């Protein structure tokens, strides 16, 4: 089936930060709103049968003294800090844009709970596709929060994947920022291709994915395996649709993924705050579509998650069609969505033209597009993987 991560708790836990609000329910009301969850399997949170094994769980990427660091700050935050708990905290990036506050360590673990259960709904083959748009957080590193995010649930769900049995990951990340997180967390892995476009500019964060000058992409076994394609602000539907269409299609057919874990933050979206790219969520078409159903036309057991996206209800209005689509590729049955936002809770939000459609106007490439040919040839001959070369040359 398609599955998709909520519950009770789950959507008051991804609602308590004050970075991202009650982004996740006017998501999920939307979704509901558009009659899409008897559709659905509801997929629960993974919870745990001691603290002990939620550590084990986390610290499969994390460490443990930074583990303690946040959840000591979010005891802290239900009571000022020492000088002492502020060094402490300091030394694991715990401020600045990831602040403490009452709940964040209950708020960080949700989305690792609910990632870690959909990788498991896909391993078990009772899902071919699982979403999971509390979830996304692709900045957070070992040892250091980073851009809101506190722990790094991708990758605890890519290593969950890796480890079920050659498992191959194909991760794939559309966010305007490049993942860099998942990227570093897999940087000498071979089984775990990621790629990733974003905007690149000096100045903007995170501030890699790009040159460096040269791409790093990987070392030791891991060389060739981080993918990087970043594009100038402006870039529109079909210009960003076609940047990364060839490349996602010789990515597939290359390294033949037993699954993919996609990354879909909003924030490209041209009615963001950011404004950097100006995609959009039309189904007559949006880049965003474009890329999901290209990737689920591989027929390969697929994770969908989250990410920023910081116009809450235009991240809606997009997640509700990937959602829609999701399911009409999957199941192969017509989802039939109004062109008018239904009433509902969160109605007075969508104003004031109360449409789904957004409310928007709507040579460098070919080097890069040379650029990873080269690299994925590189990957494939250091891993020893059959192919046709101009069957993949000939997408472009
Ligand atoms: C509406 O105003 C805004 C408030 C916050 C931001 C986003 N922002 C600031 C730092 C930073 C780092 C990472 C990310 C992100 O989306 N990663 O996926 C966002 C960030 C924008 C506008
Ligand atoms: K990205
Ligand atoms: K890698
Ligand atoms: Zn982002």
Known sequence: SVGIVYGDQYRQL???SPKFGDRYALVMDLINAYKLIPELSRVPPLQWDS???????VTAFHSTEYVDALKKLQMLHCEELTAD???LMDSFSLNYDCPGFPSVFDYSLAAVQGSLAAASA???????????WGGGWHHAKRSEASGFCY???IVLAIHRLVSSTQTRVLYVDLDLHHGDGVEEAFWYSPRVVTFSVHHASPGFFPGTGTWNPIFLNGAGRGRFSAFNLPLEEGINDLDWSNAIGPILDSLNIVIQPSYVVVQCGADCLATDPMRIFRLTNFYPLSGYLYAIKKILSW????????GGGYNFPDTARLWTRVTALTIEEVKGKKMTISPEIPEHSYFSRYGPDFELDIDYFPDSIQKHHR???????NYADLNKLIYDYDQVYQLY
């Open 14 to 16: 991804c609602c308590s």
């Open 51 to 57: 603290p002990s094994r939620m550590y084990e769980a």
């Open 85 to 87: 708990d502020e060094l």
């Open 122 to 132: 896909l391993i078990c083959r009772h899902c071919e596709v699982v979403i999971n």
């Open 151 to 153: 722990l790094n649930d």
């Open 299 to 306: 027929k390969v057991p697929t994770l969908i998650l989250g």
């Open 371 to 377: 650029r990873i040919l080269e690299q994925l040839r």
